[PDB]
Amino acid sequence: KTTLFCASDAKAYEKEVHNVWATHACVPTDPNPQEMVLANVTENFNMWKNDMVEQMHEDIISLWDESLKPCVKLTGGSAITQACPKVSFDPIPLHYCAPAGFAILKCNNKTFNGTGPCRNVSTVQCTHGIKPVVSTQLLLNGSLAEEEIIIRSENLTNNAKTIIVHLNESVNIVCTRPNNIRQAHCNINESKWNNTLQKVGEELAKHFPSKTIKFEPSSGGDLEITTHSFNCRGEFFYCNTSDLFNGTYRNGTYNHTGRSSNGTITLQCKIKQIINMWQEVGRAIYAPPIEGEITCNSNITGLLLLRDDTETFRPGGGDMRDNWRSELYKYKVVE
Ligand SMILES: CNCc1ccc2c(c1)N(C(=O)OCc1ccccc1)[C@H](CNC(=N)N)[C@H]2NC(=O)C(=O)Nc1ccc(Cl)c(F)c1
Ligand SMILES: *[C@@H]1O[C@H](CO)[C@@H](O)[C@H](O)[C@H]1NC(C)=O
Ligand SMILES: *[C@@H]1O[C@H](CO)[C@@H](O)[C@H](O)[C@H]1NC(C)=O
Ligand SMILES: *[C@@H]1O[C@H](CO)[C@@H](O)[C@H](O)[C@H]1NC(C)=O
Ligand SMILES: *[C@@H]1O[C@H](CO)[C@@H](O)[C@H](O)[C@H]1NC(C)=O
Ligand SMILES: *[C@@H]1O[C@H](CO)[C@@H](O)[C@H](O)[C@H]1NC(C)=O
Ligand SMILES: *[C@@H]1O[C@H](CO)[C@@H](O)[C@H](O)[C@H]1NC(C)=O
Ligand SMILES: *[C@@H]1O[C@H](CO)[C@@H](O)[C@H](O)[C@H]1NC(C)=O
User: Fold this and answer.
1) Please, which residues have CB within 8 angstroms of residue 231's CB and are 6 or more apart in sequence?
2) Protein residue whose Cα sits closest to atom 2 of ligand 5
3) 257 in ligand 7 pocket by Cβ < 6 Å?
4) 311: which of 16, 66, 303, 326 is 20 to 30 A away, CA to CA?
5) Is 136 close to ligand 6, i.e. is its CB under 6 Å away?
6) Domains in the chain and their CATH numbers?
């Protein structure tokens, strides 16, 4: 309804690039924030049409332009060349704050699916701290649901609409390029993956009740959406999830179909230099990988799915506003 500002813990003395950007663009966080409950009000939210998401998307585009400069950027006809130094890159949390005379309304219902009316509301001046993590298929390093796994969609009957699964317990994923230069792998505990994909099948079943629930690898598209892609320490990883989204949930029981080995699923990955950009339609070329071991240890805290008797779900992604939505869903600017 208005333009918001960001607050952060960044420090002007980190040269990590999120820190640099935030110290120029954000104000410091209030050490003790005000929050004002109101259990009577009942207030309508819509996470799928929330202008906080558009403002955040702008900010993160700006951060990546300042920070992860490509050697070449192809946008349509044009090709732009610049210095592409290797940088230190680790996302930090960002708070979005309402300016003077507006407030941010927070929905306090633990199972609120992001849509419709909400009974227990609050007024705050800033959101919680949201780490702007760019990735597909798996949402990393977010904040888990309080109670049960929530299923969010602008419209579950429209199978073109992305489904956000909000996990209530996180699942560890560890990706490494050991000391090819391009070759890397990720490891997930097959047990924890089994467990969470069962519970996700249960919630999906509540919404599609006759049908069998199948998980299957992403069909087609750019490598960025057909693998789980993400930035780790500056380098762009592309990890094959064919052994991860691979399993059936038949009779209130889940059966994993993908290959494990000693109780860990291992995704093969490549570090790539030609990137399809998430900010706009365009390509970006980066320098070859840094030296040594490149490792990220992340929490899978949500999933992005697309639905095709039987209902089949494939990993989705590609529109980073859904990443921001998965965090901003309980908030609304007012007044
Ligand atoms: C229903 N939604 C389907 C969908 C599928 C695929 C995409 C979108 C949307 N895009 C999308 O919405 O852009 C936002 C937008 C919206 C409206 C108008 C313009 C732009 C992307 C369009 N950009 C290209 N074509 N170059 C494409 N996504 C990626 O390229 C991607 O994620 N790359 C990547 C790079 C690095 C990392 Cl680390 C990473 F994790 C991922
Ligand atoms: C979310 O809840 C609303 C009612 O609050 C309901 O109308 C809508 O269908 C639900 N959507 C999903 C994806 O569960
Ligand atoms: C998370 O939610 C699921 C499904 O809604 C439920 O079965 C499970 O017990 C919950 N787990 C935890 C750790 O709260
Ligand atoms: C969402 O789903 C379908 C589109 O397939 C359509 O009936 C309408 O847009 C929506 N329906 C409901 C119940 O929201
Ligand atoms: C879940 O993973 C463990 C580890 O391999 C396995 O022993 C167990 O049988 C699996 N459960 C399934 C596939 O339902
Ligand atoms: C992932 O690996 C499988 C089997 O190794 C292969 O068939 C599939 O095409 C791969 N997908 C991508 C996007 O690399
Ligand atoms: C599941 O994994 C196996 C081996 O890891 C693979 O052969 C199979 O094609 C995968 N399922 C699908 C639907 O791709
Ligand atoms: C997730 O957070 C951990 C701890 O801050 C970090 O080491 C890891 O690299 C993060 N993952 C991504 C993809 O940013």
Assistant:
1) 68, 89, 134, 135, 237
2) 191
3) yes
4) 326
5) no
6) 5-334 (2.170.40.20)
